[PDB]
Amino acid sequence: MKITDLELHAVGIPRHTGFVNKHVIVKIHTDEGLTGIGEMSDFSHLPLYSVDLHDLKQGLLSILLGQNPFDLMKINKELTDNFPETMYYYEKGSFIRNGIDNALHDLCAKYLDISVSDFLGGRVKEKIKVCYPIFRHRFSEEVESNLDVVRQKLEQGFDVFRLYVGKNLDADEEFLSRVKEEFGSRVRIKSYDFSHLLNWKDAHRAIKRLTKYDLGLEMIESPAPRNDFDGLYQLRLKTDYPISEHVWSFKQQQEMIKKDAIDIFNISPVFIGGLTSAKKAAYAAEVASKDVVLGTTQELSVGTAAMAHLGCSLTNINHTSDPTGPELYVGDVVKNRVTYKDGYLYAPDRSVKGLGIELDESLLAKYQVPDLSW
Amino acid sequence: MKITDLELHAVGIPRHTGFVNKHVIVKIHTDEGLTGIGEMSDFSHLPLYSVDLHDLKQGLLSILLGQNPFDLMKINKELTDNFPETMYYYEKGSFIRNGIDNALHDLCAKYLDISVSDFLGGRVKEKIKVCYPIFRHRFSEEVESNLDVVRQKLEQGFDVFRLYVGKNLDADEEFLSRVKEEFGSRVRIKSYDFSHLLNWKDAHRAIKRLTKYDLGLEMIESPAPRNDFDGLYQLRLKTDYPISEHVWSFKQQQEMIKKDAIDIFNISPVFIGGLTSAKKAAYAAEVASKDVVLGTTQELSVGTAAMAHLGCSLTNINHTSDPTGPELYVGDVVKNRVTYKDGYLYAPDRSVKGLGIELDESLLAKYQVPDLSW
Amino acid sequence: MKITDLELHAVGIPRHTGFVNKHVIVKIHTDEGLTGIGEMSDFSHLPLYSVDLHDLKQGLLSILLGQNPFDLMKINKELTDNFPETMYYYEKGSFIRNGIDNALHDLCAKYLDISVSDFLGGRVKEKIKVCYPIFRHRFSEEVESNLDVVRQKLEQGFDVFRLYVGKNLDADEEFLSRVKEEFGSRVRIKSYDFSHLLNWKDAHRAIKRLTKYDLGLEMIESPAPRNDFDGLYQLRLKTDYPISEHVWSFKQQQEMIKKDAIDIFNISPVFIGGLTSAKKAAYAAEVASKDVVLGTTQELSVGTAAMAHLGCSLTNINHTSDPTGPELYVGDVVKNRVTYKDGYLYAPDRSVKGLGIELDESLLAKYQVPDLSW
Amino acid sequence: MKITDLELHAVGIPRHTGFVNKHVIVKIHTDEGLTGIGEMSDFSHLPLYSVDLHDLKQGLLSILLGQNPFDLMKINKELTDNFPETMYYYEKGSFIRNGIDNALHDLCAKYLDISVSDFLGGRVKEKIKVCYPIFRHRFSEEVESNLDVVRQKLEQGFDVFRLYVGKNLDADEEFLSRVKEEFGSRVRIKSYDFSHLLNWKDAHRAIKRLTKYDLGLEMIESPAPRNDFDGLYQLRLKTDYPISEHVWSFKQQQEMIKKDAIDIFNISPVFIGGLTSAKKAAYAAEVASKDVVLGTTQELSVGTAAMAHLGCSLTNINHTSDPTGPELYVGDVVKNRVTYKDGYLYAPDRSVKGLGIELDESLLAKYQVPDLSW
Ligand SMILES: [Mg+2]
Ligand SMILES: [Mg+2]
Ligand SMILES: [Mg+2]
Ligand SMILES: [Mg+2]
Ligand SMILES: [Mg+2]
Ligand SMILES: [Mg+2]
Numbered sequence A, B, C, D: 001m002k003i004t005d006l007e008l009h010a011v012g013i014p015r016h017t018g019f020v021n022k023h024v025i026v027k028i029h030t031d032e033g034l035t036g037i038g039e040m041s042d043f044s045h046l047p048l049y050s051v052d053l054h055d056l057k058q059g060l061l062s063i064l065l066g067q068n069p070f071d072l073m074k075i076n077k078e079l080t081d082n083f084p085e086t087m088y089y090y091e092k093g094s095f096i097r098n099g100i101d102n103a104l105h106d107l108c109a110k111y112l113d114i115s116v117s118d119f120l121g122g123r124v125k126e127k128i129k130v131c132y133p134i135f136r137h138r139f140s141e142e143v144e145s146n147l148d149v150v151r152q153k154l155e156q157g158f159d160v161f162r163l164y165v166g167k168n169l170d171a172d173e174e175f176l177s178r179v180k181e182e183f184g185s186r187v188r189i190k191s192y193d194f195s196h197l198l199n200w201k202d203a204h205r206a207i208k209r210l211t212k213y214d215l216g217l218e219m220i221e222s223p224a225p226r227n228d229f230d231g232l233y234q235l236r237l238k239t240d241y242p243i244s245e246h247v248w249s250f251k252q253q254q255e256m257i258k259k260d261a262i263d264i265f266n267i268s269p270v271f272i273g274g275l276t277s278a279k280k281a282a283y284a285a286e287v288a289s290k291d292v293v294l295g296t297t298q299e300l301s302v303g304t305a306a307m308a309h310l311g312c313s314l315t316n317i318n319h320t321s322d323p324t325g326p327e328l329y330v331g332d333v334v335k336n337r338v339t340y341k342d343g344y345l346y347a348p349d350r351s352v353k354g355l356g357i358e359l360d361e362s363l364l365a366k367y368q369v370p371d372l373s374w
């Protein structure tokens, strides 16, 4: 059983807001005709340079050609050797490794005629609670528009949201006051996300006035600069609420564990390099008796499905997660877009082998983009 | 696909030394006729009390009956809920969980018609280097006998050994001097194992005189009392050689990681509760950029095979391991025992489904024992 | 003067709630006809396995046979060698050592024709204040039932209780509000016990809202996971109230002392291995200028009497203790069940030699159980 | 059973060197005619003031009169309340409490018709290894004289000595060189005692040149100023050999434990206030997994016997102790002095009740002194 070819399809699916994110859909072919599909989700992040996909395909074929897809540990070591972890949130090498490793999981599962769920340790639950994002306000003039978003997603079933804060605290505060006023307990904002834009002391001040509003608040995310482990720790000690942070490299995670800097590890395959790497991160968290939540970069259906299977196999997810990427796009490239019901992401049909998602050649062709250029 | 019955066979296989260790061979049956086999290896350790196997079978059936063997994460959480980690090296609950989880791996692999190796992440190598143990001297009068053991195992291919030290340093020293003298570089003693019997400062003194002899020395193991994390750390700082310690609970491992107390994590399924738990421990080590070696409690072929598959799937095993249990027994309960050659333990033929080991009913009957009584 | 035989009687005494706890009553016979009695209190705790009493009797006879009961230090070292401390709250080896050491105290005292009190250092007081437990609420619907419990025990003299909290804070809060309302200062809740189910930060949040009600509150017990010494310390620093924790091993106690992690050491013979071990723990606490309280696992009269003698001999017990085990059972196996008056546990009659409690063969036969099976 | 009177006899027994040390022999009488004897050993230490024995007798009678001698915990708390621990090596209050508590142990044991050994926890061994002291050299001219002392005590059975060092390192070095030369391995110097006269760094330098000679060296004692816990710790880290220090108060011991400042706790009843306090110190050491040795202030037979019983009841004495006080005096006030054989102190005949030592009125009369004046 061996890998014989690889395909990288660049696609651009516009968000309802108009901005077009670029993704790379992965196909790994074998000698027995089985093909695994994966997704190098959202390349549209800084740094402001783009990867040559023709060159990339050659490099990856050099790595995978002739290999046994079941040698996940071996292949992942080789992938990491060529695309080293960078300690940077949006390292493009992580997105690349992610697409390949996830496609490998789909491939192996298909070969074994089982769901990716059964290749990941089975089911602990059938679905995980997720939230819809409300992006940070810059002016109080945006509050009204965001209240409309909340009302709309709420009727569609999303009763939990996460709010990006830090730019305009007066606006953040107005929004929260308005939601509490109009929706009462009908809606919950499980997280106030600072996205690393404030130093911990400024975050503490913000946290102090924002938490005046507690609508089912579960965590404060990224309340310190990237990799400021000591700052996270100090803030963790002054904050009643759990502190969460994204995991972007094992080195970074190792340091936050050693220092007991955070309470919840926000893990997402795309940022750590795939399902294999995400499981390791999740297990490291488990060994350290720490909670986990699934994060997101706004992936499409194929990338979101990966997390659906992973999330339903973990025993240490006790809070609301973030993967609602499909909700932000006008379309996708699959035959069956992932489904959200009552603010929940369900694991794909367990009787369907592989990832449980199927690509649609017509859509792949429709959203096709020449390259990943900016 | 569900579990329908469970069998626990207590057996007593005498060591070449005469002492009879007791083990419990596990069989997990399903509705489709597939059966997984496992081993609750060596119950003959303190505390000086024994488990009622009739009661145990009922308790475990209560847990497993009707479950889908592929729900490893779910089942393991339930197993840990009923047999909590104890922070004690020889917690019998660990041996119990181990036998069940390993049998589940064999069961799932058989169902999928693949080797346990392919269910664990594939192969990184086809074999791992192991060592044969030379137990601690009490009197210098024992040195000669142990030199005979070294000469015998060496001609059988074992060129690497581990030496238990700490009781009689003069005897330890004579042995090492004699081996260096007679065998030169033909033999290596990869570890000096104190087995937690000395406080770190006394170990440091011992390490100082013993390391005068360096025959391919790779590590100093358990040079401090059980759970003395601070002592291990201090000793790690004063010792040039890597410090290794057995992993017996996630809490203990978490603390040694946070404190950077050791250099090599000695992991063995039996002491941590099975393959699922051992993989998590191995991955936590990997995430922390720490080395791993496979340890042992002197298991039989079924338990040793588990480590053979695990060991060949890990990318962070860069030292010699310890599983040579079968070499200490006069027999086993399998059709074909594990295979050693030139001091290496080979992972069973990847073409064979399951664990690649098969029970022998007549041998099971032959070594059968009524209970686990002392 | 030597030990000639040993007897282990397994018994099951149902609680008023119906659940039947199993205990093992101990009898140690000598060559001079004197017999010491002890109690391996409440074996009904996880792990979910049970000890073979036939095997256990053989192992213990192997240890005790022919020994001089007055060699307590020697015998206890040997007991600990065979039943090592585990760092786990409910290590069955502790229960076993406890029953033997306590029976030895009874035996020696009888031989000397003095009360166990006079063998333990005499009297500092004649009784110690204790409290009755109110188990944790899961639903607010249980509050009424627990208020009835409080009213009933209060009229029987128990004006002090301990409350298990952490599962449903809204329910915990309602209960406390209701008691303050109905009983005012007539009743005191000396402790809010989290039983290690919350990580320290979540406990801190709970402590913050629960302590809004202070009905003679004396301590916050186990507000962190088992063995989370650093967490206890951090919480100790953020909490005005004393922090208490159970002592289950010398290693654990040593760490909480070194780190100044807690304010009150909750000591109970059953969890530390007997009177000899409990005295050492109490004295270590004294040397460290730390307060002590006697804890419980809900023992019967024989086990409770042990604590009555111990408690009245210590000079560092300045808070309310927990041993009201007999109050939860429908019966016992003694001729004289322990005395509770005005919420106080009195030390047995000092003029009666030994423990001051006598077994009742008829009751022993009535509550006899064939084994410790689950 | 109650205390009815107390007697304090001041005595002066000259050392073979001529200097006359003063001690106070204690007698505690009861209503049943039983009398306990104790010893307030060696009052001849700074500070340069002396205690009024007439006043002291009144103060102690005020405390003890009418009390039940078996109330050791109660009486000791009261003794400590009136003679608080001082954190100073030679606090006279400790000597005072010691004499009373030890007399109480003798009294209780006599009442029960058992050996003090059986009142202290029994026997673990029948004797403990001790050493003879060689006082510090000031001039190299003293070396010869001390070699004569070694040769003399060696033929009498004392093959182990302790050497006081620090004043003249050249002399210390010559002595050690001369002993190694003349006696070879016939003699051992188990400890180099600095007696707190050097700051830790100067001690380290001394330790470096003195340990060039290792004649069965077991420990380095008091290598730092009194109560310099941090200095002891730092030195403990730079020294291969165990570091030992005398225990003179629970506060001091608590700090050395918390800081892990030493390896061996040198405990002596006289410096800590008696058998009751010495046992607590020994147990605190045990709970902390630390080794213990019995120290000395050069007591007579009654005080030395106390340690003989204590020493043979402890399980954590794994090194040579120091009580050879009787060997330095020309006489005593007992009918039969303690027994040494081959460098061991034997616990008095266990079949003899009480301390196993009896006073000689004739000797008491001939050695009596008017007071404790300097
Ligand atoms: Mg975020
Ligand atoms: Mg993105
Ligand atoms: Mg080992
Ligand atoms: Mg073993
Ligand atoms: Mg409690
Ligand atoms: Mg209990």
Ligand SMILES: [Mg+2]
Binding pocket: D193, D195, D221, D222, D246
């Ligand atoms: Mg000294």
Ligand SMILES: [Mg+2]
Binding pocket: D042, D045, D296, D297, D298
């Ligand atoms: Mg003196």
